[PDB]
Amino acid sequence: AAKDVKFGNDARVKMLRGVNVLADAVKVTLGPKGRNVVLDKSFGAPTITKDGVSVAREIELEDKFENMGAQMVKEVASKANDAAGDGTTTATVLAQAIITEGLKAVAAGMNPMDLKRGIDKAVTAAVEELKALSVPCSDSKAIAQVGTISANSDETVGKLIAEAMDKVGKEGVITVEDGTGLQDELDVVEGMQFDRGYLSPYFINKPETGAVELESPFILLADKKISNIREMLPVLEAVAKAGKPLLIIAEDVEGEALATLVVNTMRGIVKVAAVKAPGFGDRRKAMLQDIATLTGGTVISEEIGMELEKATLEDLGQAKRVVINKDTTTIIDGVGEEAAIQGRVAQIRQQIEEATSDYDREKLQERVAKLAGGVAVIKVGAATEVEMKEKKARVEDALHATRAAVEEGVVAGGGVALIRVASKLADLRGQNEDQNVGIKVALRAMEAPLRQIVLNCGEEPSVVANTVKGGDGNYGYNAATEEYGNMIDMGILDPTKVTRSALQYAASVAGLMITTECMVTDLPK
Amino acid sequence: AAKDVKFGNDARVKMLRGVNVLADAVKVTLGPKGRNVVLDKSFGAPTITKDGVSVAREIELEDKFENMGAQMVKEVASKANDAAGDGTTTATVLAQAIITEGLKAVAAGMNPMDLKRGIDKAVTAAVEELKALSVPCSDSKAIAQVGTISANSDETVGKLIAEAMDKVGKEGVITVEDGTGLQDELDVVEGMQFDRGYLSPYFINKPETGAVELESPFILLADKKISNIREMLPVLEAVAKAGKPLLIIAEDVEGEALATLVVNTMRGIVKVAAVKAPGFGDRRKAMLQDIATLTGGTVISEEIGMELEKATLEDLGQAKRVVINKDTTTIIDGVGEEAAIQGRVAQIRQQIEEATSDYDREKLQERVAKLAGGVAVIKVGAATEVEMKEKKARVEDALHATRAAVEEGVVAGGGVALIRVASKLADLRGQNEDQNVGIKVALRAMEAPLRQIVLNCGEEPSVVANTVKGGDGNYGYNAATEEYGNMIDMGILDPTKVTRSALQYAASVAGLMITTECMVTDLPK
Amino acid sequence: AAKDVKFGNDARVKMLRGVNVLADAVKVTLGPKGRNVVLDKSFGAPTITKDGVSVAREIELEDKFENMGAQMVKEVASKANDAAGDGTTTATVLAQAIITEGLKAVAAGMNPMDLKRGIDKAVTAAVEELKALSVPCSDSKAIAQVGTISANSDETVGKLIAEAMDKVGKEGVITVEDGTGLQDELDVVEGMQFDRGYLSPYFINKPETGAVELESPFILLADKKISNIREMLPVLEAVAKAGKPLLIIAEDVEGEALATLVVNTMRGIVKVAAVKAPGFGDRRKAMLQDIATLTGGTVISEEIGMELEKATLEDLGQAKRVVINKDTTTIIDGVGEEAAIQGRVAQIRQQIEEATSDYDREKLQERVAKLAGGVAVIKVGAATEVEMKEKKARVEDALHATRAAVEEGVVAGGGVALIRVASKLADLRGQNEDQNVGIKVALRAMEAPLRQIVLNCGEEPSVVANTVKGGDGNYGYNAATEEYGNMIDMGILDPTKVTRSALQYAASVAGLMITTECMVTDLPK
Amino acid sequence: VAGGGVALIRVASKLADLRGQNEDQNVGIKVALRAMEAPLRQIVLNCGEEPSVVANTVKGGDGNYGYNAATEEYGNMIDMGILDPTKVTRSALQYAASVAGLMITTECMVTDLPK
Numbered sequence A, B, C: 001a002a003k004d005v006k007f008g009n010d011a012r013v014k015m016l017r018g019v020n021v022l023a024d025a026v027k028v029t030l031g032p033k034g035r036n037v038v039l040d041k042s043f044g045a046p047t048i049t050k051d052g053v054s055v056a057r058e059i060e061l062e063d064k065f066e067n068m069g070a071q072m073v074k075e076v077a078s079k080a081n082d083a084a085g086d087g088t089t090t091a092t093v094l095a096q097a098i099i100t101e102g103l104k105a106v107a108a109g110m111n112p113m114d115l116k117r118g119i120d121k122a123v124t125a126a127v128e129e130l131k132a133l134s135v136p137c138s139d140s141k142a143i144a145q146v147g148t149i150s151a152n153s154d155e156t157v158g159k160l161i162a163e164a165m166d167k168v169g170k171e172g173v174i175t176v177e178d179g180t181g182l183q184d185e186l187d188v189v190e191g192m193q194f195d196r197g198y199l200s201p202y203f204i205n206k207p208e209t210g211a212v213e214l215e216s217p218f219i220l221l222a223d224k225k226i227s228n229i230r231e232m233l234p235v236l237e238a239v240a241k242a243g244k245p246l247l248i249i250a251e252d253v254e255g256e257a258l259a260t261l262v263v264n265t266m267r268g269i270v271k272v273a274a275v276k277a278p279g280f281g282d283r284r285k286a287m288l289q290d291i292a293t294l295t296g297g298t299v300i301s302e303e304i305g306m307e308l309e310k311a312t313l314e315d316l317g318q319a320k321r322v323v324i325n326k327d328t329t330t331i332i333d334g335v336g337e338e339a340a341i342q343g344r345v346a347q348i349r350q351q352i353e354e355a356t357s358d359y360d361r362e363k364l365q366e367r368v369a370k371l372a373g374g375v376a377v378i379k380v381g382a383a384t385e386v387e388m389k390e391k392k393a394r395v396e397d398a399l400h401a402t403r404a405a406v407e408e409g410v411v412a413g414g415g416v417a418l419i420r421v422a423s424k425l426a427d428l429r430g431q432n433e434d435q436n437v438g439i440k441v442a443l444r445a446m447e448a449p450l451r452q453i454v455l456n457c458g459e460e461p462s463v464v465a466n467t468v469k470g471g472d473g474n475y476g477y478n479a480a481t482e483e484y485g486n487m488i489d490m491g492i493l494d495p496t497k498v499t500r501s502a503l504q505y506a507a508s509v510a511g512l513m514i515t516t517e518c519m520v521t522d523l524p525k
Numbered sequence D: 001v002a003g004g005g006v007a008l009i010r011v012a013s014k015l016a017d018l019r020g021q022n023e024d025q026n027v028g029i030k031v032a033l034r035a036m037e038a039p040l041r042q043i044v045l046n047c048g049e050e051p052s053v054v055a056n057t058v059k060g061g062d063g064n065y066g067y068n069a070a071t072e073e074y075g076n077m078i079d080m081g082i083l084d085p086t087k088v089t090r091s092a093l094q095y096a097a098s099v100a101g102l103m104i105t106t107e108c109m110v111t112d113l114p115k
């Protein structure tokens, strides 16, 4: 069919309508006092959420242009989600404030490119000021505190994260599992981590999780492209005889090998999850050899000579439990001997000793780190399977918050960080009047999440915003008790990384959307 | 009746639509290359004009709100016309530029009262800078030059204005009428000028002129209110017996005395033109005695004892000619004896000598000035009555331009004055960002008339505006020859007073119109 | 009330639609083969004419804008009519061609003022080339020929105009009347002609004529304004007692004196025709004294002392016949003694001898010319009153054509004059591209009347236009015989003055209308 | 050649004297001449500056002088490195002229039914 084009300020007001709709629909849920939002269910009772991601995924508009605007702000919110794990409401509120003030200025004849440049300069200054104001969370006490706060005031979850954090170290790996006993369980077993995702989202057994959890699966290692599914035919026959889940690691999986795997998984006789080969080149081959050592498998390459057709059940690796994340994959309790793993550790350590390239040396160092450090597993201990699933979700998002805090730092939560940074950066000027206007847009836009939270509490937004701007340091307004004080004292804390990512992505999408004149679209039919 | 109210930005965009319509309709006529505008006459051929006043009076819009806007900008344009005599297109273009940029700013959430303050500060700075840049026109040569330029390159008209300027001095009275001979005739006869207007516009015999010209009229002098028309009944009977025009000076004329005079003038058996009593109190009585001395009349007052009923033909004053302007009235060749006028001059001169109050002394000084200086009369001399009427109009508006130049000064015309004083004041700042924005509105708005003139010439407005801004002094772009150079060299000159009045009135009306939200209106029926 | 404004190219295409409608409806009647046009008569049968003036007066459009255009082009057509007497179709065709090509160029982004300047330059060159190509018509034979051709091939009418032309000389007065006998009558009697029109068209007894013809009227002479009708009351009573038509000469007649005279004429008990006082000042007074000598009347002035109330039947002048044209008035066979007229001739001749001012001497010379030459009288002689009225109309418009030819000259008719001038001026260039375009507009526009005539003849317009452009001199295409040849040979001749006036007026109105953007109007209700 | 559209501006300045075999070919030459200035005007318009002012400034300068859009300052594109191949500009101008000349002389635009 044909297409429709609308360009100028009409497209800008269209996309502004769209972002206003989605931004309000997600910003109702912001904060601890955020109001509930009811979402569609096509069959049965509608669902009720306070989660910004859940409501954001559902929103799409009937008219094309506002739909475009909504989808842009939604995809930048989900990008901030995948980068950080939380704060998507904060990111969308910041996006709304910047986009609204930016196009309000653009309608006043102000130069959009200069506004984008001013916003970029102001948000760079805001990011460096956030890094200046960041408080380290490397100590175990603050780690336990933020784990408690994130997991709905549960000192058990944050505590368990703290001992696991000690177990696998500062940049180690912690994995959540359901435990049978009512006591919480912590174990340390050698595991594998690599940053590769699923080939198709249809491989996910649990759409509420977003990951592919397989128990005692056979693992195949490949360094070649899966050009045809006839290479996978003997493997599929063998795994159908075995009747167990199957994991595939290959260099490239073509669209039709993936299509046949999707056909097989909707048939579901075989349980096949395929991921790309992580790393690059010789590093990729070496770490695939490490994985084969960990699982007792064998790496298949066209250059060496073996083929995917010539695959036996012994040649495939095996492990006790694997989880394929959205862009990550973890392997727990591989069959491969710890002595061979230690020998591989020694080999790559001597590779570190002979390494002259700095980047290659860092690759070998992270290889020995993942090969020797292993993985801590926290098994949830309580009485009911219901509290298994909710406490498991609490451990998951609390661990995401904890690793976000460990990665960069932690600042006083509740939006007071942006208020304080805005107070510290009111002096920033631009190269002309327009860049100064864009700087003013950014500065008055960082105050938006606090105003939204206070508005959700029922208090006067501008009053509390002026009060917090009057205070200095970490003084702010506890929304839960609705009393003023130090966020550090009440424990209301947000990671530096999540706020930095939310602000950066909101500023990027708003500067991109300000300079949008032509909004072409499909014909509404 | 029942009425509709619209307040907010909707009323602002309504009035912006209206002012844009009127401003385009009048800005087509700006400049020497200004395009023709055709106006409907209800009967016969439609008129074609290049006059901004003529088209401006003609504009009324069909919807009520845009009509409100058009009426406001029209009345400020006519106020600038009555203040100066020309430049109403310049005033309306300035008004359009200020109002458009101001409401574009107010649409961006900018503070309207602060915009008013910033515009006020920038325009008073522009006025004082324009007074600094003014060139005196007190010498006779530049007076003749500006009289030539204003009267469509006629050195005869400007010359005659120059000898009249010599005849009655710096602030004297010059009156033009039609001479029989083919040579122009300059005479000096003792006369009167006082700043009082007609009671009704229906008294005007020539609506194209706007003044009541009467030949050999009887003049009545009164210091009392005309409460009833029975006081005017014997006077009306006497003037009907005489069959000559009649002029009335009274303290007050009531609405029903005016109504009966309107009835009589549309009957027109009597020719009655009535004015207020000029001056105030004892000063008014004294100068009315002076006028009675000038015309051989008698002042009628209730306090002394005589009444308007007890009026004879001898008691009324008389003169050879009178003219009653819109807010002025002059008397030429009164009957009253020059010896009695000289005695009155001596009496008020001794009053000056005994005067102790400064303002009263100035009143007596201007009294002796008008009583002794008299009136110069210029009689138009050529072959045809057609060139009588067009050359008379040329002498009239050239004389208005000349007295405007004499009053304050003359600056290089063609809009380069506003460009230069704009260049001189780019450094002016405000008490905050809002006033700085309003100052920027004023500065980029003073560049509008030059852009409109150049646009009418067919050249690129922004290029020529940048060229003029590049040049300094009086350098600019002659539109008539379409060549750059010095306006003083090409003689393109505008009075300081007309430009100052246009700028002040446009800034006042636009800042006033900015702070208008509630826009009540009658029901559209 | 409510008024609509349309400006830009939309108003231009509106007025183009209007001028196209009027121009088509009037160009149907161009030429000897011009097709007939029928017009509504509200009562009875509709009228049928080939007269461009008759149809052009009637044309007016239902929508306002095209009506405005039509009224403008009708105004310039009637201006060319009352300037010349014929050729209004030619003027309107020229106006259509110039306006159409001009707005077609304006729609192409061309500068309208430069196009107007180019048209002005090209039409000035065309006028001077026409004056170069003009053939004198001072000879009596060519005068008789053009009188024959103009009066539908009647050698009697042109012959009688020739003897009258000999009788009153080169610039004398010729008047047409009805004669009883079947032989045509010519008689020279001392008379008056002065260029003054009626106060109101309601004074005209014959709307088909446009003039006020009165037989044996009493003539009043006045040098004062008629402020009130009480001055005319004894005169009206005396002329009601006399029961004869009345003529009034006054300095000014006010709108209410005119209103009362209009009331009296629609009452029609009195037959009053009023005119302005011709001349100016002392010249006006002197020639009014001459008219009083011619008619035995008396001049009434306020300055001398006598009044219009003190008027007797003897004081008023009298004559055998008067005619009051649209802007002219002639008097035939005044009562006043020829000896007193000769004495006045001697007095103004001595005034010529003592005259030093050139213009005053020329005024006295034309005074003695009109006072001594008199008036030639051509009374139509034939059998029927029907042929009286048609032959009288033929003598009228033939005499207008004859005096037009005598005034400036005669050129070959049929539109070949404009073709030849266009051939002589194809080399004319402008100061830039746009002025050359406007010159091209004018040059290809003067070819329009010949193309329209040939199109009315049924021949191919462009073919005959190229054939005539190929020929040189006075070679052209006779439409009556539809054969080529020299226009002089079969006598197709047009006066230089009528063609020059038509072309000048068409160029002026097209230059005025090209630079027209704001076409304001009343509400369509 | 120095990029930023100054190539077309300069060659337009070099060829303003070119005439045609009649008035119409001179008009078409004027179309091409005023049309080669379009990319610079569009770039400057995107920068937020006045297009006609900067275009007149570049036409005032000669050689490789022009207006750097990245720094928004005047100067030599050879100095700032703003460059474009002669082949790409020549091909763009040739193809635009060919399609516009082909499209001017297009009267009959036949089509399918709008359904």
Ligand SMILES: Nc1ncnc2c1ncn2[C@@H]1O[C@H](COP(=O)(O)OP(=O)(O)OP(=O)(O)O)[C@@H](O)[C@H]1O
Binding pocket: A029, A030, A031, A032, A034, A050, A051, A052, A053, A085, A086, A087, A088, A089, A090, A413, A414, A415, A449, A453, A477, A478, A479, A480, A481, A492, A493, A494
């Ligand atoms: N007690 C509190 N007082 C004040 N502010 C609080 C408090 N608890 C949380 N906040 C603030 O409210 C926000 C937390 O909102 P919420 O937990 O609903 O989701 P989010 O992190 O904003 O986003 P999402 O779940 O969509 O990724 C953060 O900005 C946090 O700093």
Ligand SMILES: Nc1ncnc2c1ncn2[C@@H]1O[C@H](COP(=O)(O)OP(=O)(O)OP(=O)(O)O)[C@@H](O)[C@H]1O
Binding pocket: B029, B030, B031, B032, B034, B050, B051, B052, B053, B085, B086, B087, B088, B089, B090, B413, B414, B415, B449, B453, B477, B478, B479, B480, B481, B492, B493, B494
């Ligand atoms: N030759 C010229 N070159 C440049 N500018 C000129 C020239 N002649 C006049 N101007 C300018 O054009 C304007 C004159 O316009 P115009 O005489 O039509 O009426 P106006 O004074 O603008 O207003 P209005 O008649 O409505 O009171 C003034 O701003 C004057 O400075």
Ligand SMILES: Nc1ncnc2c1ncn2[C@@H]1O[C@H](COP(=O)(O)OP(=O)(O)OP(=O)(O)O)[C@@H](O)[C@H]1O
Binding pocket: C029, C030, C031, C032, C034, C050, C051, C052, C053, C085, C086, C087, C088, C089, C090, C413, C414, C415, C449, C453, C477, C478, C479, C480, C481, C492, C493, C494
């Ligand atoms: N025999 C002829 N051959 C060619 N052209 C002719 C001939 N007779 C007249 N013409 C031309 O035709 C026109 C005469 O037209 P017509 O008598 O209908 O009125 P007009 O002069 O055009 O205008 P109007 O009557 O409206 O004032 C003139 O241009 C004249 O030169």
Ligand SMILES: Nc1ncnc2c1ncn2[C@@H]1O[C@H](COP(=O)(O)OP(=O)(O)OP(=O)(O)O)[C@@H](O)[C@H]1O
Binding pocket: D003, D004, D005, D039, D043, D067, D068, D069, D070, D071, D082, D083, D084
């Ligand atoms: N710094 C600069 N200053 C001025 N002009 C520049 C500058 N950088 C690039 N340009 C000009 O901008 C244009 C480059 O635009 P862009 O890279 O978006 O794509 P393009 O070459 O126009 O076309 P497309 O990508 O569609 O094939 C060229 O005309 C180039 O000369």
